[PDB]
Amino acid sequence: AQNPNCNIMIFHPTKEEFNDFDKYIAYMESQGAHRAGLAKIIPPKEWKARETYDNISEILIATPLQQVASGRAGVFTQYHKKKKAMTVGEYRHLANSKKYQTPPHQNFEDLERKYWKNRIYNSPIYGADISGSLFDENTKQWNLGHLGTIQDLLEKECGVVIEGVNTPYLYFGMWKTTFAWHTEDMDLYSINYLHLGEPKTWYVVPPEHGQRLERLARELFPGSSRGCGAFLRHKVALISPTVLKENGIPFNRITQEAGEFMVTFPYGYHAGFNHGFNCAEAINFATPRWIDYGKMASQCSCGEARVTFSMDAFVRILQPERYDLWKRGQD
Ligand SMILES: O=C(O)CNC(=O)C(=O)O
Ligand SMILES: [Mg+2]
Ligand code: NI
Ligand SMILES: [Zn+2]
Numbered sequence: 108a109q110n111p112n113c114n115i116m117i118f119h120p121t122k123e124e125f126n127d128f129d130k131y132i133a134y135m136e137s138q139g140a141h142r143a144g145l146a147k148i149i150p151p152k153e154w155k156a157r158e159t160y161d162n163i164s165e166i167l168i169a170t171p172l173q174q175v176a177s178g179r180a181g182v183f184t185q186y187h188k189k190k191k192a193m194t195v196g197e198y199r200h201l202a203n204s205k206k207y208q209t210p211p212h213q214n215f216e217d218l219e220r221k222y223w224k225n226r227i228y229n230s231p232i233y234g235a236d237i238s239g240s241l242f243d244e245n246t247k248q249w250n251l252g253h254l255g256t257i258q259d260l261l262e263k264e265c266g267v268v269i270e271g272v273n274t275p276y277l278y279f280g281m282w283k284t285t286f287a288w289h290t291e292d293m294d295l296y297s298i299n300y301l302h303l304g305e306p307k308t309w310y311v312v313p314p315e316h317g318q319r320l321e322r323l324a325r326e327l328f329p330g331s332s333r334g335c336g337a338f339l340r341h342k343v344a345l346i347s348p349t350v351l352k353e354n355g356i357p358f359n360r361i362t363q364e365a366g367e368f369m370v371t372f373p374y375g376y377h378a379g380f381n382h383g384f385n386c387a388e389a390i391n392f393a394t395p396r397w398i399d400y401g402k403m404a405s406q407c408s409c410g411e412a413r414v415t416f417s418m419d420a421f422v423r424i425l426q427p428e429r430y431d432l433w434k435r436g437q438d
Pocket of ligand 3: 289290291297371377
């Protein structure tokens with residue numbers, strides 16, 4: 108078995124190997140990459156996502172989210188308070204203000220310590236889930252706006268034709284902005300490109316150990332657990348590395364820098380934070396190996412997680428028994 112300790116793997120494809128996306132994903136899995144839940148891909152030196160970022164300030168962040176925490180430093184939830192619209196130029200200036208900027212630090216490890224110690228005492232503002240793309244249309248390789256669609260993968264594997272579309276999303280972050288512990292909708296893959304700015308640190312639990320994380324989360328968030336049988340789908344809960352180590356949960360960590368891709372694999376729980384002002388682009392995708400995960404994926408039916416038009420069809424075809432109750436949650 109390849110990668111039996113489930114370590115995060117890092118890949119350095121040549122420009123020749125960067126032509127065929129599906130084939131490279133399948134290569135990475137042949138080496139065991141999926142067992143970690145997360146992989147890093149460093150693009151060939153010849154490749155670029157676009158020529159410059161010099162004209163991005165006029166993108167609108169229509170609903171910036173202020174991430175307010177409750178709990179203790181290592182075990183907290185966050186809620187998203189909606190703020191007034193602002194441009195990317197306005198958001199970048201805010202991120203660089205004395206109130207919100209990255210503190211002085213020695214290295215990534217000192218900054219990680221400061222994040223876990225101090226996150227709960229601040230409320231950083233995140234521009235999340237903004238439909239759009241920063242890839243130039245002439246970028247032919249690993250362009251996240253030109254991938255094969257999940258609807259087309261389901262049709263190719265299963266023969267069924269379904270409604271829905273699959274498009275990327277932009278994320279504009281600042282120091283302390285946080286992504287809670289989650290897997291993807293319908294336990295899909297995701298791919299994330301860090302276009303610009305400061306790094307993003309990731310934590311991940313191997314898929315084969317995801318249920319260990321769920322059991323710990325039911326213990327740490329007991330009221331949430333009684334309210335919903337899949338409450339990590341709400342994307343609100345944070346658990347520190349120290350707490351995960353104290354409770355014996357297997358995990359790994361890695362820092363992504365500008366210019367690098369990350370891939371999350373089906374049922375790979377992940378969480379993390381941004382080090383300063385940055386812009387990432389991400390999209391879900393599928394392969395043949397995903398289909399069985401999609402059939403088994405948990406769902407939120409309490410009604411909090413409230414998800415896309417396209418997830419309807421996935422539930423309807425892969426989880427017909429759940430269909431009914433899940434659409435009661437989404438209506
Ligand atoms: O970058 C972020 O805030 C969160 N992204 C993801 O969870 C991902 O790409 O799967
Ligand atoms: Mg602009
Ligand atoms: Ni994710
Ligand atoms: Zn729920």
